[PDB]
């Protein structure tokens, strides 16, 4: 009941926080968690697929923003807080920009919002929100938004 062996190579990356995002199997789990939440939402309360995709896109907003762009530092005390003025997004790949793994993380909030709109017939009750969420996500991940804050709110 076990096949498909993969010989993973260790990328140095010398950072416990953001080195696990290079081993084989991350993208598949990323997507299977989203597809699992979608089914579990419309089972605990029977509803329309469109709304359920909306609740998935709204929950994926808070979790991803609070984790990749709000929190600063690392939860490991071994590095003596060397990364205190950086967020998880900025620590990735030692600051290298537009890599394979950054483009995948940029591309998901867009394609997930397209699905939550194309099955909800646009409208305005949900359109207004989903647009705000995806806009915030895509702006926060711009290359020019590197180590720059907004009015010095959670900046130092």
């Amino acid at each position: 009941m076990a096949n498909l062996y993969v010989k993973a190579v260790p990328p140095p990356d010398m950072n416990r926080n953001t080195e696990w995002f290079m081993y084989p199997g991350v993208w598949t789990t990323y997507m299977l968690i989203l597809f699992f939440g979608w089914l579990v939402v419309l089972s605990v309360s029977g509803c329309s697929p469109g709304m359920a995709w909306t609740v998935v896109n709204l929950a994926h907003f808070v979790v991803t923003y609070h984790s990749f762009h709000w929190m600063k530092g690392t939860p490991f005390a071994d590095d003596q807080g060397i990364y205190n003025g950086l967020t998880w997004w900025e620590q990735m790949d030692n600051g290298q920009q537009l890599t394979r793994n950054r483009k995948f993380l940029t591309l998901v909030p867009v394609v997930l919002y397209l699905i939550a709109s194309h099955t909800t017939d646009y409208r305005h009750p949900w359109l207004f929100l989903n647009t705000l969420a995806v806009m915030v996500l895509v702006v926060a991940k711009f290359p020019n938004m590197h180590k720059v804050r907004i009015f010095g709110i959670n900046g130092d």
Partner: peptide
């Protein structure tokens, strides 16, 4: 350097 079964990853 380590072979990892995909279904376990």
């Amino acid at each position: 350097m380590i072979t990892i079964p995909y279904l376990t990853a």
